[PDB]
Amino acid sequence: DMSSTAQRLKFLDEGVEEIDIELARLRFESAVETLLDIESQLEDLSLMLLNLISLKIEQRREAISSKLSQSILSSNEIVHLKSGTENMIKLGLPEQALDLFLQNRSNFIQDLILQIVDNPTNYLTQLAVIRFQTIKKTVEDFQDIFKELGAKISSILVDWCSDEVDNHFKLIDKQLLNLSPGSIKSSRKQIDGLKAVGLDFVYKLDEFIKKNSDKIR
């Protein structure tokens, strides 16, 4: 025969399978929204059938992450990166979303830098723009997306920011293997402007200068 809960349960089983069609046609929002409903719902009813549907949810839950991750990792325009990052968040994976999202910004940076040493200062300057321009923008987008996310997630942001700055200097270190005072004002400025999105990394510039004094003249 048929009971009341077994009724509800069978629909949850329908719901689960729908998530495959939704992920199919690229509706990541719908995917997450249904998934969380089938789980907030699945929480109240808590058996054979339950544990059985519960397992199908983990399955799809996983599947959604894989997609979002892969998706985030390859967005061109912000709009893609934007939502993907959010849905990855709504799913309840804010750190993994931030973590992946920043890697995307990182790669954007690698790839652009490859796409160019013609002449010493034309290199160093173009290099700074690229870097600090994506560091600033990534902080401004991190603001309109990871808002109210917490102190930790927000410290992580800053860490990647620290390393990116570091990278740039590691890129000059190679270059100092065969600097100029017309490169300093450029970089400095490029670094002071970071303060506009709350970042003070003037110190890294200064330190790097202290140890390469002999090679700046």
What type of residue is 182?
A: G
Contact yes or no for 61/31 (Cβ under 8 A): no
Give CA–CA dist 49/43, Å, rounded: 13
Same fold, 1-116 and 117-217: yes
Closest CA to 131 of 167, 79, 104: 167
Domain limits, the chain: 1-116, 117-217
- Experimental resolution (Å): 2.8
Hey, what CATH class is 1-116 in? mainly alpha
DSSP state of 32: H
Continuous H helices in 74-180? 78-90, 94-114, 120-145, 151-175
Give CA–CA dist 203/43, Å, rounded: 51
Contact yes or no for 72/104 (Cβ under 8 A): yes
Contact yes or no for 97/88 (Cβ under 8 A): yes
- Which CATH number applies to 117-217? 1.20.58.1220
